[PDB]
Design a protein around this ligand. Sequence first.
Ligand code: CLA
Ligand code: CLA
Ligand code: CLA
Ligand code: CLA
Ligand code: CLA
Ligand code: CLA
Ligand code: CLA
Ligand code: CLA
Ligand SMILES: CC1=C(/C=C/C(C)=C/C=C/C(C)=C/C=C/C=C(C)/C=C/C=C(C)/C=C/C2=C(C)CCCC2(C)C)C(C)(C)CCC1
Ligand code: OEC
Ligand SMILES: [Fe+3]
Lengths: 246, 38, 31, 421, 30, 137, 37, 333, 105
Amino acid sequence: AKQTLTYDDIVGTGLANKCPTLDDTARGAYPIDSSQTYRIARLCLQPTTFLVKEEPKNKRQEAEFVPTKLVTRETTSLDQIQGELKVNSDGSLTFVEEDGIDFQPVTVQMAGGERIPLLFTVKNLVASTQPNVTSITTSTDFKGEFNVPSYRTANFLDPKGRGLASGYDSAIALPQAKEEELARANVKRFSLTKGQISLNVAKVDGRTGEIAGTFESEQLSDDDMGAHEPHEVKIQGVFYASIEPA
Amino acid sequence: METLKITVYIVVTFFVLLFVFGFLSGDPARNPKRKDLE
Amino acid sequence: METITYVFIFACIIALFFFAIFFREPPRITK
Amino acid sequence: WAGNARLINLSGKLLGAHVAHAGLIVFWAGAMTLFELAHFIPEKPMYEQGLILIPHIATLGWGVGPGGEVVDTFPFFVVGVVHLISSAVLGFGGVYHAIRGPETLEEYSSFFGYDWKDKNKMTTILGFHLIVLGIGALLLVAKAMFFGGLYDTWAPGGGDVRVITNPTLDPRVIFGYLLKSPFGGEGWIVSVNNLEDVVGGHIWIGLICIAGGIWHILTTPFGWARRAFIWSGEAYLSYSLGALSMMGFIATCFVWFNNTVYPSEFYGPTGPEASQAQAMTFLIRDQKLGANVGSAQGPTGLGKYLMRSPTGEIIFGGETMRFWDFRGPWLEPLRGPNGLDLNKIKNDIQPWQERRAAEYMTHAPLGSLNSVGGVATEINSVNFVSPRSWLATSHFVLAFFFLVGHLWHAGRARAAAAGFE
Amino acid sequence: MEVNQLGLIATALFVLVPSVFLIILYVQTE
Amino acid sequence: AELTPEVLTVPLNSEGKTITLTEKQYLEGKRLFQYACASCHVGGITKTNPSLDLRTETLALATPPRDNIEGLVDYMKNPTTYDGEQEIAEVHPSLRSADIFPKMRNLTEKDLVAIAGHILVEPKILGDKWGGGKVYY
Amino acid sequence: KLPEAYAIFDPLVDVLPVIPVLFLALAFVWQAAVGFR
Amino acid sequence: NLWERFCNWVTSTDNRLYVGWFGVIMIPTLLAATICFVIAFIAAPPVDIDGIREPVSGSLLYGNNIITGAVVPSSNAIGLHFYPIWEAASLDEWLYNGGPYQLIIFHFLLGASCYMGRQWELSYRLGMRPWICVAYSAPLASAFAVFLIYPIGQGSFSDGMPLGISGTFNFMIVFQAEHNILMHPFHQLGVAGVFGGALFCAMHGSLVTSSLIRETTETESANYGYKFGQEEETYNIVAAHGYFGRLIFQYASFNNSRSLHFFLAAWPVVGVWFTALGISTMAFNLNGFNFNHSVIDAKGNVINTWADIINRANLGMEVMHERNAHNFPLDLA
Amino acid sequence: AATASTEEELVNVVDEKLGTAYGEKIDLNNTNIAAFIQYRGLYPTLAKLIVKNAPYESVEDVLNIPGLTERQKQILRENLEHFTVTEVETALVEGGDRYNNGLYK
Ligand code: CLA
Ligand code: CLA
Ligand code: CLA
Ligand code: CLA
Ligand code: CLA
Ligand code: CLA
Ligand code: CLA
Ligand code: CLA
Ligand SMILES: CC1=C(/C=C/C(C)=C/C=C/C(C)=C/C=C/C=C(C)/C=C/C=C(C)/C=C/C2=C(C)CCCC2(C)C)C(C)(C)CCC1
Ligand code: OEC
Ligand SMILES: [Fe+3]
């Protein structure tokens, strides 16, 4: 296969971020040849919008999801992966990745200007499809989980230099002060968390290009190793996926 | 915002033609206090 | 408020400009 | 001691001077070329010694093999000598014309060489010198297409001297470079990637010079041109003076960010080269320690090695994120649609690439007056200063002062016209 | 933030006294 | 307080014999180090691979041993990963890789020996500094 | 050093390229001998 | 016809200013900068200087006092690229990536440049010489050097020079820890030019004040001025030239008023001429001297020269400038 | 105004508290590769593998890594004595444990 769209062309309007398209042919066709052999995968991941559900008038809330404005421009998207597709003893498909891309977009919440940076995760992913191999596009399914680390690393040094593995251990500027309240900030904490994501295929085609669909994930915001508790998040978008083993 | 970009350029070039055409100007040219050569 | 005070003393330094440059005492050769 | 200003009107002596300083410019051309092939040692990075012209001479692919110092020594001695003698050929001329006797009263002479305030004759003299550049420019073209090539740093393998064929002579392309944003990586003249553009970009100049040289020869300036410009002798210096300044800048910036024109192989690595070179050098190093480059997470959350550019591609992370616009023969093969291919990276990376990274990364343009190499803090046991920093540095300086000159002499032409004289 | 409120009174009087002062003298002048 | 013989009485081979260098040589060692090294090995610290230095102690733990001259000479001709399982001639200067590291083309056995000497005498003079750059870091 | 047979002249060649500067020098001596005007 | 009536306006005295072809750009330009800039300092939101996701906010509303800082440099991502407003999306974005910086800078330089032109052009309409155009050229050139050339030489406007008091200091510190200026003649002549101007602006005005016309309507209860109409001018130059001459020696003193005032405009201007270069020269990495080692070949024992304790401080700072924004061992820019 | 359950949990630095099982021997599940250089011919290749097959439940389990050579095992034994094991520490591991650690230079 080969119609070359040079990096020279793309550097112009930012296409990288938008995953490749699958326009007309709607042939959810892809065989049981799996039962016959194995398959790997290369997947593109892109979103359309982010959602921060923050609201604190406790006991009187059902659903509080506000839209969001991108401060970190054309960054999100970027997710170029490799993953293997397996068949389990019950006819379903499971996913397991190799490179593990991740990103750091920041969003400004209308309401308070309160900026919220989330680490967009897909790392350590695990995937699943419902019943069988007889159909694909018709009934589209793929769902699994994430592992979400922390926006910042042990080496990150804050305004007064004091973290895990480096940085002072105290508030130097105020020697003879109370350590209690400041404790919170003078000690950094590393958080690893819950990941949830789901997929829906709207276009499958030919024999080479295989998937493309509706994105939808839910992770947690950055807490700064010991600051305000994380505001919850929900992400939605589009995606691209190719496959072929023999 | 594309509406903004346009508006600007008009403004900018506008005041450019006033710089340029202000100098090439056949009318004021290079008129000083001590001697006018026209 | 730490603010308005840095602003207040600002507006004066510009008000003083205008008034110094446009309302100054004349430099005349009537002498 | 405005001595040189007493000469203003006696053009008979200026010729004596202009052709005297015109003799130094060539003298230096020999004194330096010979001084260089003197100290010059073969097979040691041209730039790790401290050369400047030779690199120019090898640029024209006068004497070199695929990015190989020099196979043939000689080509430089020719240049060193020629110019050193042209300095006497003219020293004689300048001196004579300076001391044996003034001008303007020779009847047959005044017919061949006239004076100031005479738009039609100044114009004519101007066009003349324009017919000369039209040529020299076109000669460069000759030396690339039907003569011993020119040095192409691009594709493939080593890019030794190569002869060009059908230069980009498209009418559009050439001036497009003129109509492009002079910002972020894209400098009109500097953007020049393909060496073929450069050839064709010279053909058009000459045609334009010549078509112009003759133009003023035959034509005296129109009204608008007459009422905008003054015509004093000092004023023509102000025009020409500021022209050169811009260019000093021009070339300077032109120097720092290389176009094939300044093959980094002789001149050294580009300020960004070094940084980008340092990123790549370390992907490999850890890649050899089995580190996975895609999932890396630097203390910032940006991944040590790979991140994006606002338009969404992949670029080496770290402060070297500001030089993702950087392009050279070593880093390119890993380039592809969407930015850097994470699959060519860890799979298809040849060794000779690590070398270049390490070398450049190692000879960072960074240096001091003591020729101390590297960071302001290093120990004096390493001598180096990228030619580029030398050219960029000194040349900036002149483009500045020179501007101060555009102001001084042009402001004094306003004192002639009526002001103070 | 935490600032010493006496600053205000300090910084206001700095603005006024010397100023008032001079204001009195520019009137006697005329 | 001058440069002494003992100072230059450096180990020559693994077993226990030693050679005492001279003034003339020592100096050629520097001059050479600066010539095809310093750039990458300034003050005896790898710029390309900071976790590996040229201090004496770290050289003895190499494979094959390198706290002595014969070992260094071998290395300069043909390279050896800290363990001795890879041939890094396509990466590190080597008389066997002259064609790629032109600075090497001219070199001679006498010069390797001296270069090696420079690397073994230095630490007795500089001490900690030559290591991870103390004065320097 | 690659001048081959001319070897002999490194010297003069070495102090050669400075002269353009020394030109500036005479210029002032020229002036000294002419009382500065 | 109208076109002629407009030009005449622009060209002569307008009872407030002179706004010639040069101020046709200078006036609308420097206005956009002022306004934008004043507001950026009173409310701009935080801006992450180095691409990293660690925003710095040096504005009044966001917890600062005057010295604490101001308008912060563009991102290091947009670093060297052109970042206008139209080119981005929401202003919430723009505000984060340092937009105000570029916008303010570029207009200011242009209009700053024209403020210089304007100076000359007024000369042409008043038949006087063209010099003031030249003396301004020193700082202007310098601003450009600091605000332009460097970010142009370095690879990103970020770390141009913050528009705050505090950051000015930062720029300085980081700067000599990265290029070691102190030991660079161009900044040395700089201190010469400046400490010069101080010594001279005190000398002149001091003497000019001591040799006054002791007897002109000056009593012990009043002190009233001169005005051009006053022939002999204010002071007895023979008394000053006599004074200074007797303090050191005849030559030392200045005979006439031209050599005096010419000196006053020569020393400062040609000092900063150089400094402004200094920076521009270290913008492309031709950093100052650095005599890091003097030895005792005896054993080779390194002896620390006063300059090494200078490198000891320059050191501590290198290590911590732009903490956590470095992933590789050696900075190269 | 607080209590010990909250305070103590926070008054804990993950890295500080490891300063006990650590510092006397090399930790086999987390420490950057460059910690292997302080022993005879252990760096280049074994280091690469010991790091990639982690985590281990007993220092001796290194021997089981696949594709190993005879001698390889032999050397691990002699050094086995310098190793140690401890539960994986989230921090040190999710940030290139091999090179993130300041390249001292
Ligand atoms: C295009 C080239 C050019 C030309 C042909 C002229 C020509 C002229 N200039 Mg102009 N000038 C120029 C560029 C030029 N200038 C520039 C770029 C500037 C800005 C700096 C000036 C600034 C300038 C001023 C300020 C003045 C002139 C004046 C004059 C007239 C001077 C006669 C005289 O007394 O010279 C005498 C010249 C000298 C004594 C030369 C001093 C040169 C410096 C100190 C040398 C530095 C070298 C250094 C030692 C090297 C170190 C080594 C290195 C390797 C590190 C003459 C018509 C004068 C005038 O009145 O005009 C009508 C005058 O006052 N010029
Ligand atoms: C850029 C270089 C430069 C040049 C080309 C000139 C040129 C000139 N100057 Mg200016 N000058 C300069 C810099 C320069 N000056 C500077 C920096 C200053 C300030 C110090 C002055 C101050 C100055 C003053 C004060 C005066 C001049 C005057 C003159 C004119 C003298 C003509 C003459 O016959 O003299 C007489 C000639 C000689 C004494 C001979 C010099 C011989 C040279 C060194 C020989 C070199 C050898 C030769 C190449 C051998 C060839 C051999 C062959 C086989 C190849 C001449 C046009 C004079 C004038 O009034 O002009 C209108 C004058 O009064 N100048
Ligand atoms: C007729 C048109 C004409 C032409 C073609 C030139 C050309 C030139 N001028 Mg001149 N000039 C002219 C008219 C002209 N001028 C007039 C009317 C005046 C006013 C008096 C001047 C005043 C002037 C000044 C003041 C200066 C020049 C300089 C220069 C040279 C600049 C460098 C260059 O571009 O090199 C490109 C190179 C070439 C085009 C190579 C030409 C050589 C070839 C091989 C021909 C050799 C032919 C030879 C005569 C054969 C006879 C052999 C015999 C045995 C029979 C260039 C040679 C500058 C200079 O540096 O002086 C030399 C300078 O300072 N010119
Ligand atoms: C920038 C480039 C440049 C330029 C534009 C010029 C331009 C010029 N040169 Mg110059 N030249 C240059 C570079 C340049 N030169 C250089 C680098 C050198 C050194 C190689 C020379 C060397 C040079 C020489 C040696 C001569 C010129 C001459 C001339 C002029 C020739 C015009 C002509 O028609 O001659 C054609 C020639 C004639 C019409 C000759 C007529 C002969 C006279 C009138 C004889 C007088 C003798 C009589 C018998 C005496 C009776 C006295 C009684 C007491 C007994 C012209 C102005 C010539 C000149 O100025 O002389 C007129 C000249 O002789 N040039
Ligand atoms: C028309 C403009 C022009 C431009 C943009 C270039 C550009 C270039 N040349 Mg070419 N050249 C030109 C004309 C030009 N040249 C002419 C007329 C000649 C014959 C004399 C040559 C002869 C030549 C040679 C022999 C060589 C080059 C080389 C190069 C490259 C050198 C790298 C460098 O430092 O450039 C420096 C670039 C500049 C200083 C840019 C100046 C920009 C514009 C033109 C200035 C506009 C202002 C001016 C005052 C306009 C007046 C107009 C009036 C109406 C007011 C570069 C791509 C080298 C190479 O390796 O290339 C193959 C080389 O060896 N050039
Ligand atoms: C050596 C340089 C040179 C110089 C000094 C002049 C000077 C002059 N020209 Mg000439 N011209 C030249 C070269 C030159 N020209 C060439 C090569 C051509 C062929 C295209 C022409 C064609 C030409 C024409 C057709 C006319 C003139 C006219 C004039 C006069 C115009 C008055 C004016 O400046 O108005 C104000 C000037 C402007 C509004 C233009 C500013 C332009 C900027 C500074 C340069 C842009 C350059 C370009 C982008 C760079 C090339 C890049 C490369 C990579 C391709 C003036 C005396 C006029 C005249 O004399 O009438 C009888 C006229 O009608 N010229
Ligand atoms: C060798 C080619 C080259 C050249 C000649 C230049 C030249 C220039 N660069 Mg560019 N640059 C280059 C390559 C080059 N660059 C490359 C490869 C990059 C990639 C990183 C950059 C990145 C870069 C940046 C990031 C910046 C520059 C800037 C500048 C300008 C600085 C001087 C100034 O303040 O002018 C002031 C303006 C003038 C003297 C006007 C000359 C035009 C005519 C004669 C006058 C028009 C008058 C009217 C009042 C103004 C209208 C202007 C319009 C933009 C509104 C100068 C024109 C700076 C700038 O100011 O941008 C333009 C700047 O910030 N450059
Ligand atoms: C108290 C004694 C003292 C002395 C003697 C010096 C001396 C000097 N300092 Mg230091 N300094 C001092 C205290 C001192 N400093 C203190 C307390 C500090 C703060 C910690 C500094 C901080 C400091 C800094 C930060 C710098 C200096 C620098 C310098 C040098 C500046 C050169 C200069 O242009 O000065 C200004 C003075 C003049 C321009 C004029 C002096 C008068 C001269 C000698 C007259 C010449 C006239 C001649 C005899 C007659 C001609 C007659 C006429 C009619 C023709 C100079 C060597 C600078 C340097 O470059 O360092 C190497 C520099 O950057 N100093
Ligand atoms: C200051 C002045 C001036 C000027 C001057 C001038 C301008 C000069 C010039 C000069 C010149 C312009 C010169 C040149 C010269 C040259 C020479 C002198 C050469 C030589 C050579 C030789 C000797 C050779 C070499 C060689 C060879 C070729 C080969 C090999 C070997 C050898 C090395 C031998 C004037 C007069 C105006 C006036 C007064 C002042
Ligand atoms: Mn603003 O900065 Ca020119 O030094 Mn190195 O790179 Mn980034 O770190 Mn500091
Ligand atoms: Fe005065």
